[model samples]
Target: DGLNGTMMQYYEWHLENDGQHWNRLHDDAAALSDAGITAIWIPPAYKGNSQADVGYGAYDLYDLGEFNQKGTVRTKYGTKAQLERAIGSLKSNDINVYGDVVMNHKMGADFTEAVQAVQVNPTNRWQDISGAYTIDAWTGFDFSGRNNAYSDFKWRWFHFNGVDWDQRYQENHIFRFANTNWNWRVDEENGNYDYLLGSNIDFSHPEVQDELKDWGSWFTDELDLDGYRLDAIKHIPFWYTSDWVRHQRNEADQDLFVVGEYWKDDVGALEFYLDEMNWEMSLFDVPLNYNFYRASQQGGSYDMRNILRGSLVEAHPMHAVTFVDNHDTQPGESLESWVADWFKPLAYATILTREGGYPNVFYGDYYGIPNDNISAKKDMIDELLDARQNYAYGTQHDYFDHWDVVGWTREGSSSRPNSGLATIMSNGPGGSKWMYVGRQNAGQTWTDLTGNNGASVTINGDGWGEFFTNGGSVSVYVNQ
Candidate 1:
């Protein structure tokens, strides 16, 4: 789950450079591939503007057929030629490329006949392809209940940074099944549902479904892309959108891996969408993302009790191509675009290594954030990824007995002789450290991954602690 996409500033620079006709990837291409990054997730290969440099702001699907004018396949990152060369580099390194796709909204404020039809035609336009929702509004999105519509709940609107609200409902360019109109509930008691957003395409519509199938099939066939990172997935009805992915995957003739950005933190709520969805949906693991946030911002609340509650399972776990902080989250969605260091790397280990989900290491230029130590973060990530590759499929159970001192244990796949056991040691409050081995791990020699001194322990009584301090993580595996 290593991402090779632009982090806001970089994306904007890429767009301008490409607009002026520049050869991209020539510089970062070789180095990134050689770094052993398995997957490169780029911004949407669609037409867009500085308003949204990442390409989810698609103007028209057909317009992008020509890279010279439009920005679809030839997006902000580089020209089609540069893309091919970069793709070649990644493939040579046995790495895959996944395109970030916007199936939710079309780009531009301009409306086509299709867009108008979507906004005006009530039943014909806003169709429930799978009969999941009475309307297109998902549980969390829109917050259309009563007076909640206008209020910005951090994410209620498209507001972030200096970006303004996108009013046009450009449907012709994006994949939509059911969602014609945008209405805000006047009040819980009021009869009127006020319309706010310009137009929303209904993903449940047959026309929309076919379009997506065609898009995915054509893109994969033409570009040989490995997978897709679906945008605004939570906005659509579960039964409707998820099934669309299945159709697209079948048409593409390749396993379409998609990691959805729901902008939510409740694991319990996300679990429903994770398991019940129609297609093989990949997730960003928002719940885990927040736990990592809690670990850093909140003096690292360990809460091992919650850890032991461990509910993660392959049946419905996070993505094999997952990430903690992306361009939209880390620096892009913050005050003056700032980020915490050790917390980010520690999070990479929490989900990518200790747990069952795929981990994504976001890329940032060392110079992008002068004070933000990019190399250190990446080094920590490499350390974690090394362990992950060594233990792709293993058994992990949350361990407990201390608050703000959480931990989990992992044993590699039993069939593999090279397999071994490892433990994630985390802390909080008074800032402590601990690891559990189930049985007495007292005499076993240990190698601390986070630069710690090895010490002997009595059964489960404090395995050992040296470099481990409060508010961070330490990785330890048996040293034979």
Candidate 2:
């Protein structure tokens, strides 16, 4: 029997650093599995620059709250013991765990060293602003607290290619070290996107690559992880990523599901990366997310027919991870493009009920972001999840002929009983669309699971039904 699997990103940006997140995850593992969630993508469990750090400012990869290197024994989430418990609980409930891996840059260095460097234009990194000169750069990481426990390798100036801050001059700029150039393969945004925040890692260095690979293997074995969520892949070299993923799969002897956050709204860019990586991993459906945002903002004027026009999910369904919003898409984050409240359900329905892409649910949407005063959409998402688990299956026939009203249907399969549904949504005035569910479902009564339409529909002997929806809403019709 085929199961409709779903993933839930279990963290948000504005969560309080109360050190109880791991405990909460451990307690909620069984409930989440019962709610039709097959996987959970957790935040970075490693120790960051500070206790309040949201795990992106990676300081030490070996220290998963085991050492007091960053002036705190425990990370924002919790200690190493609690994290292990959480993972164990999730696995016990048969839920796969995906660990977030941040490897593009390192922050909060333990020491500084005077090194020869030259400044470059902030907007255009190819243009040199100054000649080679001596600058005090924080490119040393001793990991004093761990004391060479898991890894005895100490990071120095040669391990990195660039730094953003120079202590001696008390200035911050994009400073590339002498005899070092930007990676050949990287995003061409802002001249060259090799140098992001903090100390940029030099993937060209042999020692650097070897150390990261070792860390990857250690992390996978230590946590007993089933997958990985790579952070900031556009800045990192694609060749290195491909090599690292191959190495992990070989070492584990299993197909470790990996997804990267490319963070681009163009399907072409994603396709290029997929080709570069040899189709080894999946990527977030950023173009579909932007489409949802635009549709939400424009409301009645937006055309529902072109909703999936340039989305990755439409092009490469197997390699696309569809989602509505995540940590960065929240209200005040860097990539804030929150879909309007009125269109959230419609967006979810588009991803959840469809046969393309692996749908992901955001924790911020399930549990309200209390800091922003946003209410929870748990009830709506729960009903949709129920529909996905029980009724979303079989052959899909899309009805994308209308500008404001569009729909599709699933023909029930023989393997699963009563497993067929019709999904209709609108960005403007709602209407009805005649879609084919299945010839076997003829003369059957169908009810609106979303309750957006009060009237039920009867399938004709020809296996067609006219599904109805509310204005700016979605209705899922399932066998009554």
Candidate 3:
């Protein structure tokens, strides 16, 4: 899934502001499908806690499952029928769907008697025994609702230890930002939302594991899903996910592409999980986020060095997926609205031309979003997608590593007439304009794909001069 990082936000968009039912989500999903995007990334869609309508904290997996009896054809986004139909429409147009799998924990876990008081939500759910809940004093959250299915349990009636959640040193209630719509997932003290929020699902339980296996297998067997983006790999019990991933792959038995969210900046920490970490490596090279944001914000030497430093990675290098911003991190920081459009094109240049991993472009609403039908840009995306299909499945090739830049050229063609083209990207900010893509043919004409006939560059006496121009970038096809 070229995750647009907005489904959760989109659900929230309609939930709070639109007052429209989940059915409207079909409209959003359809928009993505038409945009030449094949897959849609969403948070867990099962039955979520009444207050936790974002679908993360679930009391039951089937709550959001379309197969469930109480489960409506409607939800935060759309209905079961609508979702299924939307998927069908997307697939009919050559789009593949990727669902977010949460195999880590179950909801309604019982931590301990002392910690349980502030841990459970009282109003809508019938709680069940799940994870080892703890009452971190700073957040005034009680985790004691062990298997209680009562609906009157509004949990704001306790005292929270202010040290963990607030700057002040008093016990603040979990309700501090309950009504507000942001995650304050922080430290050991008063961290996490309310006790009902992210109530740890004990992955150690056999039932939980079995349930995930059953559900995950069904998706592959029933629907021909292309890939999976595991939701929260970092927070779960490490080795447990490894086994689950193995099971999922076997169930599919085809070629399954899984990208887990290891979420930590420490490559070493992420690597330990990868050794037995259950799924394929994630694209989230953590510090790269800061670098990308900074480069886009304040360009030049800082941006060049940042991009160059990021191109160096020995551990699971090809497995890494790169992106500019995602749903969670980019919004909290000052990059998007502030930086606007500067970094997007450069970021996309890296995505389209780089031979690292498959390119996943960001889907913006302003640029053919809601009515996301295909176009030349779609064909460009198709070309990139076609590039990924050829390399990933065929004989594996190692990257051509270089200082301050990483480049790879594949000699092949997917379209008719065979585009005798060599694609290269200048990773650093200014490097794009200064590159001299020398051709094997010393005597021929080469045109820049990005520019018109307004300018031309000729070869010298040796037919090896240079194509020098301060252009944005170019893709050259030799001997036209």
Candidate 4:
């Protein structure tokens, strides 16, 4: 299938502060479907160490708010029934749902075990900072809450290769477990970027691999999911992730769309990982997000010509999932590089109205971050999404003539009514561009959908006209 798709990350980090987010999402299903979102990427549905863990500090993979293993019976989102209902509602509305799979590490172990481990240099993980010594590490996971309901696969210290904490010594150091080696064929950051957080799973072990694959099979059948959003994939071995994805796809007998979060801004690193995975999954365009960040910060001084210079959309469009800002890039998160509010409309326009890449809209951008006091871009994003579904079609044209202004034109598609668009955006003072709209649109009157400028442009016989944008604003002109 043609993956010229549009998706949305349906939750923010603070989404569950009020609780019952799954039920709330279920109620908002029809409205989201009306907003032209083809799919919804929900947050980690499983039970974390606590209700407020944000799902990243993953404890139980099998417990999707069902078994009362953690401190709470239900996760911050809600119960398993609630999540299943919410996904059902979305699927009924023709929106596919993707689950966040955090398989790189396990956290909040039930107990600590004395294990021999050597401290590694945080900067250079390959160097041992200290000799092997026995210390209490949180590596024992005996889920005694529900008494081994789903799969009685008790995790031990041998299953994990490293950890970030020594419970007994009360020290914070990167401890590589004795007789355990970092997974090979992973990202080359920090010498060997395999160990990220607590209890890094040893994918080299056959039992660990088998258990993970088994969990994948069970999870797929349990949720009736369409695909997964693999979290912290760069920390996991490339070959193991490939095998897991392939196994799940075959088991499900579906395309099982998988996207990985490499979380690296370097485009070369992303391309290398993609090649390493043999193009088995798509990746978020982290480099493109950085470009938007630089452009927003630079304003008029920024060169519009280089927006997609090092972007995955330009190089590997099919395997690129373009996004503006996600949970990690929100206000105060670890990878916080939130695109400024003023530039959000332009960013949405660039991704949503583009010809290539599968675009993903951030949930915090769509719905206002009430807890964080961040304003939503629903009004601006709604119009851009409409343009994408309606008029942003056919042959593409670029208008990267000025450092402060850039735009693209779609010649139009015959399958849809009035299917053509002329986008013009400016990051500086008000300006106009004489862009070609194609001979097919000659003599056609186009009005700005954004209404940033209260005017219409008439395409001349030469298929060119002056398109206008407000100062530091974007405007989308479509056939009237």
What's the number of clashes in each of the models?
19, 0, 36, 0
Candidate of highest lDDT: 2
The weakest ten consecutive residues by lDDT in model 4 span 1-10
lDDT for each candidate structure: 0.46, 0.91, 0.42, 0.88
| lDDT, candidate 1, 1-480, per-residue tens | 323222111232223433322234435555545543566676666555432355665644433323333323454555555666666766676666777666555434322221111222223223322332122221112212112322222121111001112124312221122323332211111121121122344443555566566766666665678877776665544665566677777777666667766545555555666666642776665555555555566645446455413232233544433455556555445312223665555555565565555556665532233333344355565555555555433555554556655555554454544333455455543333454443333445546554542443233445332213334555545433
Each prediction's RMSD over C-alphas, in Å, is 10.8, 1.1, 9.6, 1.4
Write the number of the candidate with greater lDDT, choosing between 3 and 4. Answer: 4
Candidate 1 similarity to native, TM-score: 0.67
Q: Write the per-residue lDDT of candidate 2 for residues 1-480, one digit (tens) a residue.
A: 478989999999999999999999999999998888989999988989899899999999999988887889889999999999999999999889999999999999988999899999988988889999999988899999998988998888888889999998889989999998887588778788888888899999988899999999999999998999999998999899999999899889645999999988989988998999999999999999999999988888998999999999999999999999999999999999898789999999999999999999999999979999988999889889988888899999999999999999999778878889999988899788999999999999999888889879899999999989988899999995
Candidate 3 error regions (>4 Å): 1-43, 50-54, 57-59, 65-73, 104-197, 219-223, 278-283, 303-308, 311-315, 333-340, 365-480
* lDDT score, candidate 2: 0.91
Candidate 3 local distance difference test against the native: 0.42
Model 4 segments more than 4 A misplaced: 1-4
| Candidate 2 residue pairs that clash | none
Q: Specify the poorest-scoring 10-residue window by lDDT in model 2.
A: 181-190
Q: Model 3: per-residue lDDT, tens digit, 144-243?
A: 2322222222222122211122223334333222212212221112233223234344444455567567767775555566667776666555556666
Better of 1 and 3 by TM-score: 1
Worst 10 residues of 1 by lDDT: 155-164
lDDT of 4 by residue, 260-300 (tens): 99989898999998988899889999999999988878776
